[PDB]
Enzyme design. Structure first.
Site, mmCIF file in Angstrom:
data_model
loop_
_atom_site.group_PDB
_atom_site.id
_atom_site.type_symbol
_atom_site.label_atom_id
_atom_site.label_comp_id
_atom_site.label_asym_id
_atom_site.label_seq_id
_atom_site.Cartn_x
_atom_site.Cartn_y
_atom_site.Cartn_z
ATOM 1 N N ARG A 141 67.803 -10.959 -8.433
ATOM 2 C CA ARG A 141 68.776 -10.654 -7.775
ATOM 3 C C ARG A 141 70.103 -11.131 -8.507
ATOM 4 O O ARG A 141 70.485 -11.648 -9.217
ATOM 5 C CB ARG A 141 68.850 -11.781 -6.752
ATOM 6 N N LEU A 192 81.023 -22.485 -4.580
ATOM 7 C CA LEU A 192 79.877 -23.102 -4.737
ATOM 8 C C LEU A 192 79.867 -24.445 -5.298
ATOM 9 O O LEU A 192 78.944 -25.225 -5.158
ATOM 10 C CB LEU A 192 79.011 -22.331 -5.608
ATOM 11 N N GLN A 216 70.931 -13.682 -11.126
ATOM 12 C CA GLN A 216 69.982 -14.691 -10.738
ATOM 13 C C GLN A 216 68.444 -14.515 -11.087
ATOM 14 O O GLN A 216 68.077 -13.543 -10.982
ATOM 15 C CB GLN A 216 69.723 -15.139 -9.074
ATOM 16 N N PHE A 272 71.234 -19.184 -11.780
ATOM 17 C CA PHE A 272 72.204 -18.158 -11.843
ATOM 18 C C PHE A 272 73.100 -18.313 -13.089
ATOM 19 O O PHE A 272 73.390 -19.369 -13.318
ATOM 20 C CB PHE A 272 72.634 -17.733 -10.623
ATOM 21 N N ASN A 326 69.452 -22.453 -4.863
ATOM 22 C CA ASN A 326 68.736 -23.365 -3.886
ATOM 23 C C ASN A 326 68.339 -22.922 -2.559
ATOM 24 O O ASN A 326 68.765 -21.606 -2.521
ATOM 25 C CB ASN A 326 69.472 -24.811 -3.811
#
Length: 164
Positions: free
Chosen positions: A54, A121, A62, A112, A101
């Site tokens: 991803r 984040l 990621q 990531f 997570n």
């Protein structure tokens, strides 16, 4: 000293180069140790041969799902999941290494590398290191991502381990 680990990354079977990461064992020893051991494979499993599944341009790349290769899998050296150690380190900019997570206290093996400051984040994802060398490789990986996170090339961690 803090561990230095490496990821050698292919795209469509051709080498992009090496990402070197400092793991901030001084701040997050349990989280750093998990990543370090998954890099060497010393527990009998880990990142070698797995993918960046991803990747979103102007966000992050990621990886770390070495069981299901799709975001649903992975596991830690401690068991399937382990707690958020602390949120001391922040998502300050490109090159930050942080745990993916599925909500609070669900760290496994997914991680990531940021390509921008991801401040939203902070307090949600445990930051545990940063890129020492190979931001060029990270930008290449990034360039093979999409808005949806789907990669346009197969991005594989061909080799990984501990430098020091």
């Amino acid at each position: 000293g803090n561990p230095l680990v490496y990821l050698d990354v292919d795209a469509n079977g051709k080498p992009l180069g090496r990402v070197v990461l400092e793991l901030k064992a001084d701040v997050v020893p349990k989280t750093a140790e998990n990543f370090r051991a998954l890099c060497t494979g010393e527990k009998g499993f880990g990142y070698k041969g797995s993918t960046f599944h991803r990747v979103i341009p102007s966000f992050m790349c990621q990886a770390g799902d070495f069981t299901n290769h799709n975001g649903t899998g992975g596991k830690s050296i401690y068991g399937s999941r382990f707690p958020d150690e602390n949120f001391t380190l922040k998502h300050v900019g490109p090159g930050v290494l942080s745990m993916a997570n599925a909500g609070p206290n669900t760290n496994g093996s997914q991680f990531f590398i940021c390509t921008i400051k991801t401040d939203w984040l902070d307090g949600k994802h445990v930051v545990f290191g940063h890129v020492i060398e190979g931001m060029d490789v990270v930008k290449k990986i990034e360039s093979f991502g999409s808005k949806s996170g789907r990669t346009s090339k197969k991005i594989v961690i061909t080799d990984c381990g501990q430098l020091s």
